Symmetry: D3
Subunit: 98 residues, 6 copies
Amino acid sequence: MIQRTPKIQVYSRFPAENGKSNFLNCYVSGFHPSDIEVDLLKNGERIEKVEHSDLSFSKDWSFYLLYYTEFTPTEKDEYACRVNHVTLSQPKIVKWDR
Amino acid sequence: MIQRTPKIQVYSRFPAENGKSNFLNCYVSGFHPSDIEVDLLKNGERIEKVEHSDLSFSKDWSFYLLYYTEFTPTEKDEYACRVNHVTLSQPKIVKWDR
Amino acid sequence: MIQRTPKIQVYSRFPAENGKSNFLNCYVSGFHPSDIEVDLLKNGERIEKVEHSDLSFSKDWSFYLLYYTEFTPTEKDEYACRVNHVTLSQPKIVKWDR
Amino acid sequence: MIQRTPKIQVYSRFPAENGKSNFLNCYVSGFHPSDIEVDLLKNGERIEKVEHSDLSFSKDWSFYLLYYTEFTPTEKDEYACRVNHVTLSQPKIVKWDR
Amino acid sequence: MIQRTPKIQVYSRFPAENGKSNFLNCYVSGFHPSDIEVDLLKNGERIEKVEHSDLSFSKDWSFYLLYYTEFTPTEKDEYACRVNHVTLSQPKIVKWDRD
Amino acid sequence: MIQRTPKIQVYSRFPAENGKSNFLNCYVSGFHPSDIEVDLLKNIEKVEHSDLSFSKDWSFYLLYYTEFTPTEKDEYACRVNHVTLSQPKIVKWDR
Ligand SMILES: [Cu+2]
Ligand SMILES: [Cu+2]
Ligand SMILES: [Cu+2]
Ligand SMILES: [Cu+2]
Ligand SMILES: [Cu+2]
Ligand SMILES: [Cu+2]
């Protein structure tokens, strides 16, 4: 039907605590989930044990989907969500801000 | 990772009882659910208010998915599940066991 | 109120890929889940750690229920679902294909 | 294996407020849910639109199950849960204590 | 707007059988869940590995909530649910009875 | 054991569609829920919420949502009232 770039929300489950355990969420929405790739990055490197919800979709194949992993944020640690999709020339990276 | 033609299971939620209300299930599993289109048919005619579960998938984009609708079985009526996919040249229709 | 023999669907979570991990499903429906015994068989022999959903039922005690186990399909192994019920004089064994 | 009169807990979803919408719960547990009949009573009379969870059970067919309905409590009304079971000659009735 | 003493239900997941594994439930309901403390006690001792459901609430902040733990009942072991709340001057303890 | 101002995420369920139906999400997380007031604003009653999730130290998270059809000149926001905040904190939706 229509081609649009996927939108990314990056936030933590509980508010950020340095040292104390948490979860990092990446909520991805858009059209046509044609083998979409989603990664969570720890200082630019892929995080191994990431999990995801089932993919939700409607009749026109608009979709949403949640990726998450258990983590403990620290001082010199930055996190991001990377998405690869057919509408994108280059993978989009969204920084987590806490 | 592999191009395979999707597999379809067609069964009723409860044992098929003439007249009495029930649900008809279509379980679809395969690889790469690229805008896959699933319909439930009443005597070869597409049923309006069909519902589906979220789509489940794994790393290689193998998937499964459930389509269902409320219906009352009778002797005259014939039910089927129709699936359209880029792997299929003709839409694959699977007849209901009961 | 009405007496019927239980109905069995046997299918894999994802399409069968040899040497790679999957789940085997047995969907059972019928009337009166009176202490019903369901087993999954690997080459005639009962699989140890099988799991099941909660039992769903309606006013007339028609029911449905899902049994499942993690398994890796091989070309030599044969899988089946076995059901014991008061309605059956013989335990019903339905083989899995594909 | 064993046979026991089923156990019954009757409580309200939220703390009782006379004239404010609420839910009434009946939690039933026991062994061998052989077509168990559970009713919620308004002044000793069956309530028409009661709902239930799926039935949970373990290997030995011990079970638990929740029955519930929307209700609005008043000072002039008595609510109860009635259970019919193969172990009971008289239907067991437990009055709501709030 | 109004506040009362929270209500506690203590029951086992399955009917109690000695030696056999089970779960112990504590269902708590009331008004204003303001940092409510719930413990399950084994012989007057706080059980460490307890779990809880999410807290459910409505517009007026009436709430309900389920606490539970896996246990194997024995003839002599006493179980109870203890709740601390700003409405309660003394901690309220509800003992578990099998019937 | 630590009084902190709550964090807010405002996003739509599906991508923003002018004239078509969607859901608006407000994800709130903080410490000590204690009778927290969350509203969704249009320039809205029948808002819904998930159960409240919490851990031992009473850190919490919670989701508020409502159905809607966005158009051109419609402004949506999430407003939160808490004992930490002197004034109700409002976070706008940017799509
Ligand atoms: Cu499109
Ligand atoms: Cu492939
Ligand atoms: Cu019958
Ligand atoms: Cu028994
Ligand atoms: Cu109050
Ligand atoms: Cu604090």
